[PDB]
Amino acid sequence: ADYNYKLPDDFMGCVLAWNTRNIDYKYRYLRHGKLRPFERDIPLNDYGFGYQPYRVVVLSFELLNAPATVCGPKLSTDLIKNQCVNFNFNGLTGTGVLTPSSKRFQPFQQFGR
Amino acid sequence: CTFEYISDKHLREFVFKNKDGFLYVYKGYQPIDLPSGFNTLKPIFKLPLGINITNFRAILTAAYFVGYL
């Protein structure tokens, strides 16, 4: 957690790890300071083929800072105006009435506030 | 090599920031020794490259100004 792989304190995502002893390395142990989160430095120690090695995969999600691309399987419907409906825009859910707008967004902007 | 990306009388100004393994770049332009005025900069891209940046250098083929955030 100090010299190899640090996660931030505000991490949002999943960590998965499984045992692989049927198919079975190096880790840094001397450094002048820790690492910042998601930093990679590329003093080395070799693992002994002690416990059976595990494989670890970490999944990190960006929360709608850009137009959305990675969504689950859901079916889209037509949009209804001037009527009180439940709406769901890119996982953003709510209840209200939708109206055509005169606001002038810029191409990096996705929603108002 | 770990990351690669290829894409298709005036002042060009940029802001470079690095946090959480991400490198953010902002860019603005204005047509006019640094003039006094107000100008606002729009984001272009952030790169998910996880290295420490403590130095940098411009690449030339006549003046450029550097300030710190």
Partner: peptide, 30 residues
């Protein structure tokens, strides 16, 4: 030589539309 940055280096803080307000933000600015 050294010069001054007279009200330079302002960028849009996030990807959110805002209109006719005053917004306070805390970030890395010049």
């Amino acid at each position: 030589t050294q010069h001054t940055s007279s009200m330079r280096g302002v960028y849009y803080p996030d990807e959110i539309f805002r209109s006719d307000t005053l917004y306070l933000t805390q970030d890395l600015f010049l």
